[PDB]
Scaffold this active site. Structure first.
Site, PDB file in Angstrom:
ATOM      1  N   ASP A   1      21.287  17.559 -16.006  1.00  0.00           N
ATOM      2  CA  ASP A   1      21.905  16.280 -16.353  1.00  0.00           C
ATOM      3  C   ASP A   1      23.392  16.518 -16.555  1.00  0.00           C
ATOM      4  OD1 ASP A   1      22.782  13.829 -17.384  1.00  0.00           O
ATOM      5  OD2 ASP A   1      21.536  13.897 -19.169  1.00  0.00           O
TER       6      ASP A   1
ATOM      7  N   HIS B   1      27.434   5.133 -27.440  1.00  0.00           N
ATOM      8  CA  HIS B   1      26.201   5.873 -27.284  1.00  0.00           C
ATOM      9  C   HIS B   1      26.284   7.186 -28.035  1.00  0.00           C
ATOM     10  CE1 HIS B   1      27.920   8.536 -24.096  1.00  0.00           C
ATOM     11  NE2 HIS B   1      28.415   7.442 -23.544  1.00  0.00           N
TER      12      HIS B   1
ATOM     13  N   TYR C   1      34.927   4.153 -22.703  1.00  0.00           N
ATOM     14  CA  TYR C   1      34.729   3.069 -21.748  1.00  0.00           C
ATOM     15  C   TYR C   1      35.528   1.890 -22.243  1.00  0.00           C
ATOM     16  CZ  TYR C   1      30.790   6.287 -21.536  1.00  0.00           C
ATOM     17  OH  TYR C   1      30.007   7.425 -21.557  1.00  0.00           O
TER      18      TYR C   1
ATOM     19  N   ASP D   1      27.045  10.533 -12.814  1.00  0.00           N
ATOM     20  CA  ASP D   1      25.993  11.073 -13.691  1.00  0.00           C
ATOM     21  C   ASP D   1      24.755  11.314 -12.810  1.00  0.00           C
ATOM     22  OD1 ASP D   1      24.246  11.833 -15.868  1.00  0.00           O
ATOM     23  OD2 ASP D   1      24.992  10.243 -17.159  1.00  0.00           O
TER      24      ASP D   1
ATOM     25  N   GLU E   1      27.859  14.931 -24.211  1.00  0.00           N
ATOM     26  CA  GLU E   1      28.356  13.919 -23.299  1.00  0.00           C
ATOM     27  C   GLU E   1      29.202  12.837 -23.951  1.00  0.00           C
ATOM     28  OE1 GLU E   1      25.306  11.261 -21.654  1.00  0.00           O
ATOM     29  OE2 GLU E   1      23.817  12.505 -22.687  1.00  0.00           O
TER      30      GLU E   1
ATOM     31  N   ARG F   1      33.201   9.797 -18.657  1.00  0.00           N
ATOM     32  CA  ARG F   1      32.237  10.607 -19.378  1.00  0.00           C
ATOM     33  C   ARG F   1      32.250  11.984 -18.763  1.00  0.00           C
ATOM     34  NH1 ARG F   1      28.399   7.377 -19.102  1.00  0.00           N
ATOM     35  NH2 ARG F   1      26.951   8.080 -17.499  1.00  0.00           N
TER      36      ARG F   1
ATOM     37  N   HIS G   1      24.639   3.020 -17.281  1.00  0.00           N
ATOM     38  CA  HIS G   1      23.627   3.365 -16.277  1.00  0.00           C
ATOM     39  C   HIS G   1      23.789   2.480 -15.029  1.00  0.00           C
ATOM     40  CE1 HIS G   1      21.194   4.698 -20.059  1.00  0.00           C
ATOM     41  NE2 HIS G   1      21.892   5.722 -19.605  1.00  0.00           N
TER      42      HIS G   1
ATOM     43  N   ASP H   1       0.799  -1.236   0.000  1.00  0.00           N
ATOM     44  CA  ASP H   1       0.000   0.000   0.000  1.00  0.00           C
ATOM     45  C   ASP H   1       0.835   1.292   0.000  1.00  0.00           C
ATOM     46  OD1 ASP H   1       0.870  -0.304   2.694  1.00  0.00           O
ATOM     47  OD2 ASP H   1      -0.863   0.823   3.470  1.00  0.00           O
TER      48      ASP H   1
ATOM     49  N   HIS I   1      15.690  12.626 -20.994  1.00  0.00           N
ATOM     50  CA  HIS I   1      15.764  12.259 -22.409  1.00  0.00           C
ATOM     51  C   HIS I   1      14.534  12.845 -23.060  1.00  0.00           C
ATOM     52  CE1 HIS I   1      18.217   8.369 -21.407  1.00  0.00           C
ATOM     53  NE2 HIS I   1      18.963   9.460 -21.368  1.00  0.00           N
TER      54      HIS I   1
ATOM     55  N   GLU J   1      29.815  15.484 -19.163  1.00  0.00           N
ATOM     56  CA  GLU J   1      28.547  15.922 -19.735  1.00  0.00           C
ATOM     57  C   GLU J   1      28.169  17.319 -19.253  1.00  0.00           C
ATOM     58  OE1 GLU J   1      25.183  13.308 -18.676  1.00  0.00           O
ATOM     59  OE2 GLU J   1      23.991  14.151 -20.331  1.00  0.00           O
TER      60      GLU J   1
ATOM     61  N   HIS K   1      21.456  14.248 -26.321  1.00  0.00           N
ATOM     62  CA  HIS K   1      20.015  14.072 -26.377  1.00  0.00           C
ATOM     63  C   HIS K   1      19.343  15.367 -25.988  1.00  0.00           C
ATOM     64  CE1 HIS K   1      19.947  13.723 -21.936  1.00  0.00           C
ATOM     65  NE2 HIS K   1      20.971  12.898 -22.072  1.00  0.00           N
TER      66      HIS K   1
END
Ligand SMILES: [Mg+2]
Ligand SMILES: [Mg+2]
Ligand SMILES: [Mg+2]
Ligand SMILES: [Mg+2]
Ligand SMILES: [Mg+2]
Ligand SMILES: [Mg+2]
Ligand SMILES: [Mg+2]
Ligand SMILES: [Mg+2]
Ligand SMILES: [Mg+2]
Ligand SMILES: [Mg+2]
Ligand SMILES: [Mg+2]
Ligand SMILES: [Mg+2]
Lengths: 440, 440, 440, 440
Positions: D271, D350, D387, D260, D383, D404, D243, D38, D361, D406, D354
């Site tokens: 972001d 990637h 890797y 990130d 970004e 990375r 991610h 609940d 996104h 960004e 974006h």
């Protein structure tokens, strides 16, 4: 013949007998079914709901509640009476008259079912429900069980156990009572009279559908308005299609015609197949295949009795078929080898027998490969056939022949009773019947 | 009579004409429909899918793609050929033969529809789809549109506009072509022959269902296998129930019997009602009600023509009814007041006319209160009736009388053509017909 | 503290112990859950699936199969390993490592579940399934049971009995093991440290959300990343809203602030409420309400032990409340009458105690009005409160005051253990704590 | 900064501008979403519904009706006020206050939507509806359209045309207004302050989740309660998972950590990604990869302007990457060949950029391979990343490095504005920042 109030009562009590204490069984009516746009097909009640009620309306639910080993009661949900709806679509039983008419203890409006069903299941341990049978039923039952699950603070509890009643109910339907056998006995007479008439009316130049018309008229005149299944009239090569229902071709002198048709009388199915010459005279080639199928049927009718099985009799039929086919040069080689290789399968590719009852392909457990031991009260078809494809690599004279001969039987204490023998199947008797009709 | 390959072609082109460029129309086949357990009712194709194809299989989808004002093509999805399924359940068109047989450009397996449909809609602006018609169709279409929406990275795009083609297609079906009128002309003859036969066979002591049997046999013998709707045979008080289909009562000397029955011939519906004495002789009381209904019909048949409407003619019928009923003492008071109070409604509680076509209650916009101006090519019923309840507070002799007389017409340039006048309706002609039959 | 491999094993065996022979229990993982567009909320495993596995992935199903009283085995369905999906969305257990990691006998790909599940249930008598818990689960289970029902000819049979395992599993979860109590003991410490910090940081002019930030930071620093429920910081009149989570107002000198917040540590919930002055000094009016709530809590903590119930202790709290409120002139009349009239309800309108565990409002049967006899191992909250509406007809000084004080306890052999007493609740100790922090 | 009443008004009018006359647009609120049992996750409004209302309740529907080119009005459906529900779950706007508060013309109870919506769509030609967005919405809309379709006799008609408003609305959201840019400017500051703090607090021995805690506390203290997406803190090899959100490992001296994270401020997403040494000092090997990523970012920031595209800039980044990697011996061969072979893909798999807005996104059409020409008002991320898998066949010192960097930008008339440059990214500035923090 008919099914009595007291029989419906007995059936309910027999289900209740097997139910756990603190449980409810829920049996739902068939929905109405669109044919096109706002027109609907003639209504056909769910067989199981019919079995316990003889009630022919939709939007109805039988609820059988067992409190304990000596206490139980019944509640019907059904459509309320409505002057406008009845002026239009026909009379309704309603709630007042239902207790007396259907022998139930209580009757409520179907429109109140969501407000009332959860109250009936509250505090029970078990609910019997045929999950997946109808989506509208599942919605109603799940909705009721959710209210109970989530109603802890209103002191509600749901039954934690749900049991499919179909195995139990279908095991009951597998064994016919004397009343049921009388009704099926009459279904078999009516269906036989229809097949006799089709033989008598058949002439070259008529279409397959014309014999369908004669058959349905004969069903109707004895009070069996609807067939138990879509009528099959396969002449010539169409006889090689097992459930050919197009029935669209001109019947040709020289061809055979295979008729599989069955009435529905007080809910119960007749199911007869007869194959015969369109011109009233079997050819040598047609006789040669017909005689194998007929010996298969006649031997099966001698064999079927308590203690054997569909599987076991099917074995004898395979032997008869494989031998017959070897003698004609349709199969080549050693009989026993050909049997072991199931060499008959390109020509006989279906079962010999299915259960018969409120459904033409009736409910009830067959066992592996239909090995279940037969007992008195079981009702079944006997329907050997041979279907030689138009393009089969066999002597030309056999190509495009489809023959099936089907009778309906009830297993008795000492053997079986044939319910459909009043329509002829020996070739000489078929020929005499058609000759006599042509004079007428 | 029949519908030609070229007519089906014309209809598709006429839909394509009205479609936007860069669009696809999707028309789905009816699902098969259970009657009980594993048996299914005779298959009835969706009327709209039938209208564009004359194809009588389920699991089929017609896709009409319009690239621009002069470029379009068609793709059929349909069941693949399958030796096993066809040996059992009957022949299938398949993909190879479909282009030629149905005049489509391309044909694919229905089993590949989820892998192929989204490719057909990719990059289009508009999809025409009858949303809500069938759940299986909605699932297929929504599934296709979602793939496109979410396939941005695979350079897919969905049409943003979805349009219901039913208003457009139903507006087309409202106006019958010469071929359609010829087919309905034959449906009306067949149906009329059936009603004539029922009158000739009717004797006291027969059941209502027996006349149903005679009617269905007559449909079948002219090649109309199925009725367009469930046959109504309401004798006595059952005549006061508009869609009485139980047809279960013994017909009694002294009562009237109301028969509403219609064949389905090449997809098209006949729809006739005739009411007559079970014993071949109208009583004074029966004549008095019958004559009002007959004058209503005969006046309507004179009036119906281009430029009037169902609403307008219905007004004249109401006047005739209210006057007739006042003269018999069934209504009391001033005619014009009683009309203004709709005092006829307890006795005539349905519309005078509905559209007729591939569905007995055919598609097409009626306008408010059926006020749409009639034009040539529209096909409709004319069916006034009077139904005096068993318990109506009116003189005793009229209680429990239900009378309806229904003809089918096509609006022409200068009036109408009656497709069903070959079965009699003047009382003296009914009586002569039944007397002649009784000698036988 | 943590839950051991062996404990998860014990729990499975304890469920299997109570299952019928010839049965399978099916426990499904929580679905992933969209927050907005393609972003998803942090994943929270279903509590019951977590309880038996400690496995934190979606698309997983635990199947426990009991052949008989000494033979059983487990099958996990889970996501397959996938280099691309893991480079993106993170590591996966896969099938190879799962038997050892989670102590199951076998592991299969979740993508094969529809091809494998029906094989696991074939021939069993009973399936335990939490029907309605998740739609994706119901689809998978119903799909499996239908294959079995309809697979008579492939010698398949479905279990006829379906049982909800939630009553059984929730009854297990109601009684915490020593390991579970150690984990909740640490959840209570962490949560207490958070509430202490909020008191120390609170200054007039800060917003309610700022204390939420301090609390979540403290949860996180001890390894409890997420709260067990959405944090409540109701200052002033916002304290009269039980689940106020907007936390959007400036905190004002003179008001109280009510903080209801709880961490989630290894799946288990802490749940503490503390109310205190924003300025570190209770007013007379605030003390007068606070003291009633505190006596309610302190008395409840003395009373709770095996043999009593939530209902019974709630009775003592009502007496304390009604008396306190009469002495302040918030209620008028005879105490015992006011109790009988439930006159406290406008000011204390929730329960005193709920079960606590893997869910903050934990599973387990309460009995009617929470009358269930308490036993050792049960874990519950003690949370009396008084909420005087801004517009209540009571002396002005009490209007708009919301006070709740909540501790978490485990019932022991001789009484209870308070898991949350490390954060202060006596007003003088609150004031000393805030004064000390303001120096520092 | 915030979004004004007048801006929400302008947006509605801009949608209405593009709608056909005789149409209605239907925009639905997000459903509430269970976290466990609940308890529910913090509510997140649907972005598109939020975009036109700034209203943060579920069970709400905005209906915009365009009668013609100068006449339109708005109707809100929303939850009714309820004393009990509000005492429990918090305050509600209700119907009375909604017209003024949200600038709509009319407001009705959401509980009346099925009785009212069909009346609003009756007689319209077009309905704009995001089909498939939410199942509860589809049910409501389909239910309304069916009532209209079937209500011919009550003079109801359904719009035949349904149009997806998402392409139109998302094209609007793609171009930010000055108010939106101010809000995102503040989201970028808040997010930058969070990343600066994480760098300052980071010490060897802390866990990845500890930096998540610092970041969320910083979001919260500036009034951004929730992140725009689940925070990523990948130290060591975890940095190679794009991610990674487990954030469960001890951070080790010698490793890098990739963060990130992005706040949600008044609905809008920041972001930012920053990668840095856990010990405050980049190694030679770490610098060598970092410098390639940083040059990629810095060059992209110089290049992005109206007239170019994400695709075109991505090309320059690929060149920079492939060259950098060849010089380190991570790739071997001719640069231009390696570019043509997309040899960078194992290390940068990637997109570079974006859209950013109400969703991290964000919505809006990219064009094929993100080739859409950039214009002023578009907001996007930059970004680049490299890797190198733990098991990559490259010199050992580069294995297990994930970097990375960004930034968030808005395209302006002459170039771009960097919203996130207040957090450092040049390695020397990172090292100075961490050294300064360690003194303190
Ligand atoms: Mg048969
Ligand atoms: Mg049979
Ligand atoms: Mg031949
Ligand atoms: Mg009619
Ligand atoms: Mg009619
Ligand atoms: Mg009479
Ligand atoms: Mg609490
Ligand atoms: Mg609590
Ligand atoms: Mg005050
Ligand atoms: Mg990012
Ligand atoms: Mg990004
Ligand atoms: Mg290394």
């Amino acid at each position: 013949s008919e099914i009595s109030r007291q029989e419906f009562q007995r059936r309910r009590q027999a289900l209740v007998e097997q139910m756990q204490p603190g449980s409810a069984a829920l049996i739902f009516a068939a929905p109405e079914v669109t044919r096109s746009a706002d027109s609907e097909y003639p209504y056909r009640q769910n067989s199981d709901f019919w079995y316990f009620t003889g009630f022919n309306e939709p939007e109805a639910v039988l609820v059988l509640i067992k409190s304990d080993d000596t206490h139980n009661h019944s509640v019907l949900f059904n459509r309320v009476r409505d002057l406008t709806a009845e002026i239009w679509f026909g009379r309704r039983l309603g709630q007042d008259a239902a207790p007396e008419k259907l022998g139930v203890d209580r009757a409520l409006a179907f429109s109140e079912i969501n407000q009332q069903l959860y109250q009936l299941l509250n505090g029970l341990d078990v609910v019997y429900h045929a999950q997946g049978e109808y989506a509208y039923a599942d919605v109603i039952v799940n909705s009721a069980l959710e209210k109970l699950r989530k109603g802890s603070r209103q002191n509600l509890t749901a039954p934690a156990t749900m049991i499919d009643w179909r195995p139990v109910v279908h095991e009951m339907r597998l064994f016919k009572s004397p009343e049921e056998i009388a009704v099926l006995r009459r279904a078999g007479e009516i269906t036989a009279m229809a097949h006799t008439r089709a033989m008598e009316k058949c002439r070259p130049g008529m279409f397959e559908y014309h014999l369908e018309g004669e058959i349905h008229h004969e069903f109707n005149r004895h009070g069996a308005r609807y067939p138990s299944y879509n009528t099959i009239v396969g002449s010539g090569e169409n006889g090689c299609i097992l459930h050919y229902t197009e029935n669209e071709c001109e019947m040709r002198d020289g061809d055979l015609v295979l008729i599989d048709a069955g009435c529905e009388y007080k809910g119960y199915a007749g199911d007869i197949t007869r194959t015969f010459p369109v011109n009233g005279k079997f050819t040598q080639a047609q006789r040669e295949i017909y005689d194998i199928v007929l010996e298969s049927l006649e031997t099966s009718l001698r064999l079927y009795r308590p203690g054997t099985s569909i599987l076991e009799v099917t074995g004898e039929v395979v032997r008869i078929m494989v031998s017959g086919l070897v003698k004609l040069g349709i199969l080549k080689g050693d009989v026993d080898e050909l049997i072991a290789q199931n060499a008959h399968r390109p020509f006989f590719m279906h079962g010999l027998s299915h259960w018969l009852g409120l459904d033409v392909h009736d409910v009830g457990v067959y066992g592996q490969d239909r090995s279940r031991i037969l007992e008195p009260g079981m009702v079944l078809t006997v329907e050997p056939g041979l279907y030689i494809a138009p393009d089969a690599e066999v002597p030309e004279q056999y190509r495009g022949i489809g023959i099936r001969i089907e009778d309906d039987i009830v297993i008795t204490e000492t053997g079986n009773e044939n319910l459909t023998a009043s329509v002829v199947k020996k070739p000489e008797e078929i020929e005499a019947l058609m000759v006599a009709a042509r004079k007428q």
